[PDB]
Design a protein around this ligand. Sequence first.
Ligand SMILES: Nc1ncnc2c1ncn2[C@@H]1O[C@H](COP(=O)(O)OP(=O)(O)O)[C@@H](O)[C@H]1O
Ligand SMILES: [Mg+2]
Length: 523
Amino acid sequence: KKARSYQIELAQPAINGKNALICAPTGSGKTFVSILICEHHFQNMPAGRKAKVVFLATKVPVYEQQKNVFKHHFERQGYSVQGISGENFSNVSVEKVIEDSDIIVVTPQILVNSFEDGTLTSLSIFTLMIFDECHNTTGNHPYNVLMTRYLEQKFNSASQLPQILGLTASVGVGNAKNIEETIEHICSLCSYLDIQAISTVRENIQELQRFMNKPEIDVRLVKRRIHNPFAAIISNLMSETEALMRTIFGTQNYEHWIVVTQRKCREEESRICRALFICTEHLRKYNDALIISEDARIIDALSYLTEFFTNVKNGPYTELEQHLTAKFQEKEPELIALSKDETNENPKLEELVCILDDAYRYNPQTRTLLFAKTRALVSALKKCMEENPILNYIKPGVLMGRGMTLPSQKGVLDAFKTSKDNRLLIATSVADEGIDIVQCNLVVLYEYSGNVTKMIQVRGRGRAAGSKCILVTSKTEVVENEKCNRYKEEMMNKAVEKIQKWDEETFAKKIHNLQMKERVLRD
RNA sequence: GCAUGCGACCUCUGUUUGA
RNA sequence: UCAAACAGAGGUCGCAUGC
Ligand SMILES: Nc1ncnc2c1ncn2[C@@H]1O[C@H](COP(=O)(O)OP(=O)(O)O)[C@@H](O)[C@H]1O
Ligand SMILES: [Mg+2]
């Protein structure tokens, strides 16, 4: 692992002391650049005043990952590298850990936290800050909260602040519909993080196209399976429950409307009150059951329901709770017969099955990441893997936050990198940024939509020459929005390539002009 | 529990072209 | 008045993540 020539090139503007943003493609080794910057920070430190470096990483696993690189590289040099975090925060006084540490890796919230906490009131304490996936500097996200602070202190003392460093493979594109606006948005981002130079692989492009490369995002539309009995059955069982509401579908809006009706109603009042807290719930859990089958199997939907109708007995189980539960159990053996179906299943799941086989026969040692939007879905997908004879080649893992333990995470990832047991990892948003599975080959998106940023960062989870990235939708708009992104992403690059062709003064001037939009008076 | 990003939804007030 | 488009201010909700 010898410094690459573009890596040393990207370094330059930061070593000349300037607040840099390092835009360089997903996987190019920006993290190395930042440690290289870090050596040339300690090296060059003037006087007796010495250096504290803080690396900030957005989500926990990325904090862990980067914390561990940084230790393995600087501890042997004889540096104190300590990681404060969500686990560590109410076990340590930040005060000390900084003054003990030459390098602190941090979840960004912690510094925010400890700033309101009193523990800390001077960003001056560090001499270099690094923001991994720095593009997250928006509105009231921690990064900006801290950076607002940084900017205030700039005027309120003009007495040395730390050097800033943004790493990002995805500078973004605001709402910019035109290249001119995309530039206004990028320049906006540079202002938030007080950038004075943007770093690009300018001169060493050829070297860069070697090491990391990217392809298309194979989009796959599957039409909703014609003849869907299950959808009709529940909708009617909901219609009869909506008919009964006056006497006293599978969309987001139905959930929104159920909460409209649950707040309005919150002893001819009191018996009608908790009558609608019985009507709304059943309608809601029917609704959730539709939308759970939308992606999963019917067997997951009916699971979700028996899990509710056996729970209707537990609590009150009043008159109405009996007349509704019974309406279901008449029409239940109809459904459990449909569970047992062969052909009539979600064709999104038929395609994934196809897709995973297509890749695990052609290459038996592939490592996939299957991304889904929601925990429930991610977890329900693990069931869909295990229980399918054609796909249980591979043990599947799951990655998450917590409603999964932070140690339980360390395990599944550490496993998935090198196990050759579980060669596929279903994950959620935690995994979509900054995370480095060297042996990862394929990344599959299961109704994983999104911003340009997401759909750049996610396909970049696929490393190691072997790269492929396959989406699976049934929706029109999702097939399009994503195409839309492939334009926005092209536009994004030019924005920068262009911005880069300005002179020092005029870029600098742009950022100040933008910052001056955010000052504060003193009297 | 709280925060944030993101998405859906709705409202107000204005500008555009249309009928 | 209607429809369609853009933008400024606000209300609610869902997901994910962070503390
Ligand atoms: N000069 C180098 N030579 C060989 N491997 C490198 C070099 N620099 C970085 N890498 C490796 O590239 C992989 C991904 O790097 P990373 O910096 O996380 O990508 P990103 O820039 O998207 O964050 C890591 O395994 C890292 O060790
Ligand atoms: Mg990185």
